UniProtKB/Swiss-Prot annotation:
Keyword Repeat tagged: yes
Covered residues, full protein: 7 to 183 of 241
Subcellular location, record wording: Host cytoplasm; Host nucleus
Name of protein: Viral CASP8 and FADD-like apoptosis regulator
Quaternary structure annotation from Swiss-Prot or TrEMBL: Associates with the death-inducing signaling complex (DISC) formed by TNFRSF6/FAS, FADD and CASP8. Interacts with FADD. Interacts with host TRAF2. Interacts with host NEMO/IKBKG (via N-terminus). Interacts with host SH3BP4; this interaction plays an important in the suppression of host autophagy.
Length: 177
């Protein structure tokens, strides 16, 4: 619904970390994209870039300033649109969990992944974000939208039982659906 020029101008407001989170959220629906511009272009082509999808993206990114200025929506107004677009519970959860981790925790998790599978060393680095670790694990088949127990196990080893529980709960919910 919203025009591409409008959406793009909106993008200039995101920093590099937010761009990476958005590209991760668009990983299934905009295959092969390396820039947010490309991903939005792709969603436009598919009629997937709706008001609801944009609001959900901004909500997940905690950009309540942009929800107000571009859509006239408070946090609660935005919560009324969640779950009504192509965005999935799996990818939104991964972004949210990643924002609950500090740099030391992220380093530990990357080490756990490489100890579990040494081949991941070439896909990760000291600068890899949580969503990049998630994709690295997905790419070798260790996690997927239906199975996140390997990551829950890593969070449990980290002693972040709160984050582990979010992933165990998600997997149980997804399986029952």
């Amino acid at each position: 619904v919203p025009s591409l020029p409008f959406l793009r101008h909106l993008l200039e407001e995101l920093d590099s970390h937010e761009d990476s989170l958005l590209l991760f959220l668009c990983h299934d629906a905009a295959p092969g994209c390396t820039t947010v511009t490309q991903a939005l272009c792709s969603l436009s082509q598919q009629r997937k870039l709706t008001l609801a999808a944009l609001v959900e993206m901004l909500y997940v990114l905690q950009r309540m300033d942009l929800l107000k200025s571009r859509f006239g929506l408070s946090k609660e107004g935005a919560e009324q649109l969640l779950g009504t677009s192509f965005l999935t519970r799996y990818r939104k959860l991964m972004v949210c969990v990643g924002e609950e981790l500090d740099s030391s925790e992220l380093r530990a998790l990357r080490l756990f992944a490489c100890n579990l599978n040494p081949s991941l060393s070439t896909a990760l680095s000291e600068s890899s974000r949580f969503v990049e670790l998630v994709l690295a694990l997905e790419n070798v088949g260790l996690v997927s939208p239906s199975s996140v127990s390997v990551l829950a196990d890593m969070l449990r080893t980290l002693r972040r039982l709160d984050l582990c529980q979010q992933l165990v709960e998600y997997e149980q919910q997804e399986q029952a659906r």
